[PDB]
Design a protein around this ligand. Sequence first.
Ligand SMILES: CC(C)(COP(=O)(O)OP(=O)(O)OC[C@H]1O[C@@H](n2cnc3c(N)ncnc32)[C@H](O)[C@@H]1OP(=O)(O)O)[C@@H](O)C(=O)NCCC(=O)NCCS
Ligand SMILES: CC(C)(COP(=O)(O)OP(=O)(O)OC[C@H]1O[C@@H](n2cnc3c(N)ncnc32)[C@H](O)[C@@H]1OP(=O)(O)O)[C@@H](O)C(=O)NCCC(=O)NCCS
Ligand SMILES: [Cl-]
Ligand SMILES: [Cl-]
Ligand SMILES: [Cl-]
Ligand SMILES: [Cl-]
Lengths: 513, 504
Amino acid sequence: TERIRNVALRSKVCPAETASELIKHGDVVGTSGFTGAGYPKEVPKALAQRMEAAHDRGEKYQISLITGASTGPQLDGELAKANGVYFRSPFNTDATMRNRINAGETEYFDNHLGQVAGRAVQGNYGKFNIALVEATAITEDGGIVPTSSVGNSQTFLNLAEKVIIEVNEWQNPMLEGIHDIWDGNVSGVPTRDIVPIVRADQRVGGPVLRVNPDKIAAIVRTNDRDRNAPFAAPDETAKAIAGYLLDFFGHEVKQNRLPPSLLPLQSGVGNVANAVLEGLKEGPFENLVGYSEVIQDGMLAMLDSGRMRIASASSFSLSPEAAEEINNRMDFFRSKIILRQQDVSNSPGIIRRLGCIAMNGMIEADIYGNVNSTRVMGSKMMNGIGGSGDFARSSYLSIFLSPSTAKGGKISAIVPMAAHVDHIMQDAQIFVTEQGLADLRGLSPVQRAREIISKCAHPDYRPMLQDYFDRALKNSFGKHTPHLLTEALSWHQRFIDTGTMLPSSLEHHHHHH
Amino acid sequence: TERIRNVALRSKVCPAETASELIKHGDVVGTSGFTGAGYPKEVPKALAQRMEAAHDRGEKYQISLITGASTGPQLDGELAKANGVYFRSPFNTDATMRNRINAGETEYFDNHLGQVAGRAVQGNYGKFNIALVEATAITEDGGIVPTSSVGNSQTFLNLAEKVIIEVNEWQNPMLEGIHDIWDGNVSGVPTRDIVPIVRADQRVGGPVLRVNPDKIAAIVRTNDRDRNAPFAAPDETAKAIAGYLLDFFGHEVKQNRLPPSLLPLQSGVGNVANAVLEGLKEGPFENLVGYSEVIQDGMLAMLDSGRMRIASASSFSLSPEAAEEINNRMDFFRSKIILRQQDVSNSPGIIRRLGCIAMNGMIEADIYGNVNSTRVMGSKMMNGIGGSGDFARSSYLSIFLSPSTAKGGKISAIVPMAAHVDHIMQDAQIFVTEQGLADLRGLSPVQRAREIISKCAHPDYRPMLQDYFDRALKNSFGKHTPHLLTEALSWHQRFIDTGTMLPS
Ligand SMILES: CC(C)(COP(=O)(O)OP(=O)(O)OC[C@H]1O[C@@H](n2cnc3c(N)ncnc32)[C@H](O)[C@@H]1OP(=O)(O)O)[C@@H](O)C(=O)NCCC(=O)NCCS
Ligand SMILES: CC(C)(COP(=O)(O)OP(=O)(O)OC[C@H]1O[C@@H](n2cnc3c(N)ncnc32)[C@H](O)[C@@H]1OP(=O)(O)O)[C@@H](O)C(=O)NCCC(=O)NCCS
Ligand SMILES: [Cl-]
Ligand SMILES: [Cl-]
Ligand SMILES: [Cl-]
Ligand SMILES: [Cl-]
């Protein structure tokens, strides 16, 4: 049926190309889009074409692109291919955009996801010229129903001089009602409002994004799917990680340090997350609750079985098969899921009050349990900090999970010193790899190192780590957090130079003797 | 006037020595004490003497010492000298204890100060065997009136099996009424309560700590002073920093990015932050309010000048002379000050809600604006992260302040890579040295570097930093955050090897 139920706004409907003409060189553009869901698709494609055409004529044409979080091939991909983005924030997973960032062709800053809206309102990104937002429908009174994510869309609509809406008929109509949008002051000028959430299933707002219809300069009718990345079926490494984690949860419950329903759960996406979610479906724990950034495949499974009672998030992150499942059954799933603005889903006040358990991936940790989530060798961006800081620091328990090695064993995920730090020791209590689980609660840095080295490090790298540690203990400037600055980053340099962190036996290495 | 106003409790008075005997080897001890204020004094000394005797007899005798934040010679000092603390958290400024920590003789973890209560309730430090809390007075109904700080005392009282109270006649009886202790669930089992603070000057609790009298195993009458370390009268360097920041605030106000009375101010521990407050006391911003972790001399000065209307904190951090001033004028100041539990003063939910401006010192920052607050050369503890993270990450504006050099110019406070990170780039927007102010809002790492190097670095080090950055841009593995890993930490090593970061 008709998706634009406000008659007057129908007059604004126009082709993607025409809408794209509203976007000018130098513009700051805020868009919907979070974990590959709910980003605009047709206008960015048309924009990229016009950008390339300008460039070919020696005409400059780039934008500043501010999003909810990651988008997809139609947005980050097309614009990066066109070399059309001078600044990007706060989170990207597109390969072409990643290359632009790492070549210094696109300036990038990965703000904490829960803080983006506030910094935008503060003016940190400059004046927003355009808000470009995907919609399921437009209501009788001109409300904008978001699609598969909320992200920062309400904030972008508030700030933007002009607004473009893409109404996507691929998106199920019964998404209307799944969102909770607050008109409260979460991210505006102090003093802010108390965000009165005291349960993960609590709604505080309404189903629509609000915007002055007079700012709506174009509406584009679309029909195109999200980026539904393939399902990352757990491998033995992930299954092992999930096993150690579930054993730990079970023990915490038996010691009355967690209720049998655990606490509200936040998890990332990927092989390991999937393994944890399958473990949880099978585990002894009942009445689970999600308070996270994302809804993933394994969550629908638990919502269906009743193992999980509710799932709060800002976005969907589903395989094509899972999206298919939720579409054929949106009526049911809409009652089990709440999609929130990301400044609410990622609100530290709320995360702490609910006592979330945070479970996040990492590039690497050093022996003292400082965590790198972003910058390989310290300089090459992967995705971005995302909401890992929002959750890690605010959680009741902060847990980091990773294979003990990377790149087919040629890199150790436990290193003498992290090449970049995203999460300080104070923000990480539990580490899990396929080798075991380190519980660091109440430990000093030297004590942390003893646990991480013994429980988490791969056997191929443990002697090398222990050697570094032992010699640092003997020689470090101070002994509170012992280091040898002469070799702290030397394993990373070895990888840059040789493609492996494992040392040759053709030179002396202290641990070889 | 009698300090123990509950008659029944007077039967529990005993000597410090006898009290100390309640504390067993291996015990976890939660004490009052924050920025050199309100820590117990006599029991620790008696404990320390007894520990030395025991060690000499070949008897192990150590405890875990958990506090609000820093204490003083009678506590950290005495116990450190006796080699009697096997674990310490969350924050220390005593030289003897610091040496124990840097020698690996006392285990230490500097938690975010606002989180300590919750981690204690979670059991991260173990079962609390003892709470040793200094009080001004015990009310007729058995309330415990705190002294010069609140810190974590209410939590330690809740958790501890046995309670020892030191009632210190040295402390001003007029402290009674200054504290605001909330009986709601801030740091307990989830789901926690909403703390209904929506203005920095709002009281939501009562004047006393609550404890079941049955848990009080001993009360010790004491008479000794808090440890007031003086602040450096602002020199040329501090004054220049304060000047740049005040000008900055002025431009923000002019651009309508701050109100004319600014926002609630958090001013960190240390001389630099203090010097800024001195600038403010005669500044163009009126009707200021503090929502801070501590009230240092400079903030007391702002309340005196009338430039600041009210100040919230968990503790006093006053010089010996400022502490004398407030006691002689406790009536004037008592209505201008609110002392709260540290898990409330340092609550990220409240800090963000109020839109605090965070101003903190630092050891060093790298060219990308990562900040080290704690570990010199990456390994030697100074004080601790304290509340700098609670505030930096939650604040409306996060500002870091430091001389551009340390150790008489032999160390650059701006380095290629911080030897230890306490505050990531995302948690630091503004840097100020005596050389200038770097405004990093909205900038990528390479753009942050340009600002930090050009605005903040000392001229002796700027060319070296630029050289590092330019060659990194050319040769780094990735160009998003360019580094040369062979030399990223080489300045710190140069200092270790030669005593200076300046090459031959
Ligand atoms: C850290 C992070 C990249 C790990 O991803 P993951 O899917 O869990 O684990 P993977 O083992 O598959 O690694 C992902 C990539 O990082 C690489 N990687 C992981 N650890 C590495 C290391 N120590 N050194 C070099 N590369 C590493 C992998 O090779 C892989 O790269 P590829 O795509 O080229 O093959 C990911 O968790 C992330 O981006 N975190 C930041 C955002 C976040 O945590 N948000 C929380 C809410 S969703
Ligand atoms: C970082 C910190 C030590 C700086 O204190 P400060 O008084 O403002 O700065 P100063 O320049 O006077 O230096 C203080 C000490 O640190 C040392 N220092 C500062 N920068 C240094 C550097 N780059 N390298 C080595 N030492 C350094 C100084 O030498 C001095 O030590 P000394 O007396 O033994 O010579 C202090 O702010 C702190 O401990 N911060 C952590 C807690 C905090 O920020 N709490 C926030 C909420 S209250
Ligand atoms: Cl709130
Ligand atoms: Cl801990
Ligand atoms: Cl709250
Ligand atoms: Cl920013």
